[PDB]
């Protein structure tokens, strides 16, 4: 439970844990899909793919190292996992790929083979992963003509028109030192890693800063991807949520826990202490749903996603769900809040403390890049337990009550009513 972070020439962040069996090392840059353009959209995802290319991956496999990368909206990460003893050989492969081979990975035979793979990759996503496809379009319409609208995997049209030069241009503008953080998770000590880093000098493009842009903004709107050939309807609906480092960061996440997630086929899920379940189970309004409180640097999204085969009652699904959310402003109970606290801790714990260091790296990296530090799991619980019904009400009355929404859906959505009908349900009539 130690969050150590020091700065020499580069900012080093680590979180050591005795028993772990393995150690993960990697660099996390403060720029992701939110930094791209509509035309070079997908460059970051492309970088990730060559970094994991058969060539670069085989070089690490001989050495007994495993590679992992993750492209997000606000950040980007390249991670190498190793045994606690080879904590130095991971750094050799890291530097060898970001300075030495930052020209060998970009060969005309490797690039074309990779491009052909991310194309079949992004295509497969759009053709079959409907729930994530819908969630991606939700960001697209909610944050249209703004940084958060760009999809992480990039679009097919911007991808196929991408060249080696675009990779370089992005790398020379974002893979900078002032826009990076070296992260180490597993079991290795902070002093053990910082020494191996401060050993090898050479700045390489120091003092250089990444380009600036315009602030992200939420726009109440919708995108309907109707497709009657699909056997279900997948929808996602949300309001402007909370950005990371917001006073209500936790109040929002708790609010989403109150309604939680559901799976009609799992006996135990049908028994949860969620009032909404009394309404949706009678006629089986859906196969599943899940609420979320997505947070990013400039903004976020609070809402839910759902999947259903009850195509003639989608209006009841949306109506009952929105009536429940109305409650947060006027009648949420003490016990609902308390149930949420307990469940929020359990989920927040299971995330922050998993038996996998690669997840730890992403969580640590993403946090330190935005606030310059990481809030300890024990510190979070103190904030969570401090939330009162009055807090949730004040939050809901500002973020949910009579506020614009963003909608996205695909499949048999003929039954999903017009925007104004959904929007009207964001409140209730009163004397």
């Amino acid at each position: 439970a130690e969050v150590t972070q020091l700065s020499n020439g580069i900012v080093v962040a680590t979180e050591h844990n005795p028993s772990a069996h393995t150690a993960s090392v990697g660099v996390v840059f403060g720029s992701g899909a939110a930094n791209e353009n509509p035309y070079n959209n997908g460059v970051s995802n492309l970088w990730k793919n060559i970094f994991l290319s058969k060539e670069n991956s085989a070089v690490a496999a001989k050495e007994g190292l495993a590679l992992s990368s993750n492209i997000s909206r606000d950040f980007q990460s390249y991670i190498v996992s190793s045994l606690p003893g080879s904590t130095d050989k991971s750094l050799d492969f890291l530097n060898q790929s970001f300075i030495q081979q930052k020209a060998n990975l970009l060969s005309s035979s490797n690039f074309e083979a990779t491009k052909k793979s991310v194309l079949k990759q992004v295509q497969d996503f759009e053709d079959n992963d409907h729930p994530n496809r819908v969630l991606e379009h939700l960001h697209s319409t909610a944050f249209q003509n703004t940084p958060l609208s760009l999809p992480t995997r990039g679009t097919l049209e911007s991808l196929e028109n991408l060249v080696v030069a675009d990779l370089e241009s992005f790398a020379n503008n974002h893979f900078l030192n002032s826009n990076a953080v070296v992260v180490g998770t597993g079991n290795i000590k902070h002093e053990d890693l910082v020494n191996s880093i401060e050993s090898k000098n050479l700045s390489l493009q120091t003092g250089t800063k990444p380009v600036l842009k315009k602030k992200a903004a939420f726009l109440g709107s919708e995108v309907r991807l109707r497709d009657d050939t699909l056997p279900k309807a997948w929808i996602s609906l949300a309001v402007e949520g909370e950005p990371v480092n917001s006073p209500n960061y936790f109040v929002a996440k708790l609010a989403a826990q109150i309604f939680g997630s559901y799976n009609a086929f799992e006996p135990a899920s049908r028994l949860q202490g969620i009032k909404l379940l009394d309404n949706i189970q009678e006629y089986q309004l859906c196969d599943n749903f899940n609420h979320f409180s997505l947070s990013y640097k400039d903004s976020g999204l609070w809402g839910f996603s759902t999947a259903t085969r009850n195509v003639t009652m989608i209006d009841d699904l949306i109506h009952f769900t929105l009536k429940q959310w109305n409650r947060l402003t006027i009648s949420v109970t003490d016990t609902e809040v308390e149930r949420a606290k307990s469940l929020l801790k359990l989920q927040l714990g299971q995330l922050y403390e998993s038996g996998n260091p690669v997840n730890d790296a992403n969580l640590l990296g993403a946090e330190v890049l935005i606030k310059g530090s990481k809030l300890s799991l024990g510190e979070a619980f103190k904030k969570i337990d401090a939330i009162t019904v009055k807090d949730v009400k004040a939050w809901a009355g500002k973020r949910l009550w009579d506020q614009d929404i963003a909608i996205a859906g695909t499949g048999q959505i003929e039954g999903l009513l017009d925007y104004m009908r959904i929007r009207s349900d964001m409140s209730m009539m009163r004397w």
Binding site: T141, L219, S221, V223, T312, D404, E414, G415, R423
Partner: protein, 93 residues
């Protein structure tokens, strides 16, 4: 309930139309839109167009009938004046 006869309209979720695929729609909340005042400068010269194509279908039949009406009326006025009492006896019975 009792069996219902087949019609050409269903209800939400089974309207009776053909299977739709490939069409994507977009919309923006009326709340986020420019309050009603922009229906000018951009929406004024464009208007009045949906009557420039139609006025002939209305005007010509109208003209034909107004003329026919005016003519018969003026003729009746003549017939019942002094000058036309001669013609009146002729065309009357």
């Amino acid at each position: 309930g009792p069996p219902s006869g087949k019609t050409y309209m269903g209800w939400w979720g089974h309207m009776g139309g053909p299977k739709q695929k490939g069409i994507t729609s977009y919309a923006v909340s009326p709340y986020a839109q420019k309050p009603l005042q922009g229906i000018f400068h951009n929406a004024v010269f464009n208007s009045f167009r949906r009557f420039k194509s139609q006025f002939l279908y209305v005007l010509i039949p109208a003209g034909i009938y107004w003329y026919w009406w005016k003519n018969g009326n003026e003729y009746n006025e003549f017939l019942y004046s002094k000058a036309g009492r001669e013609e009146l006896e002729r065309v009357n019975v």
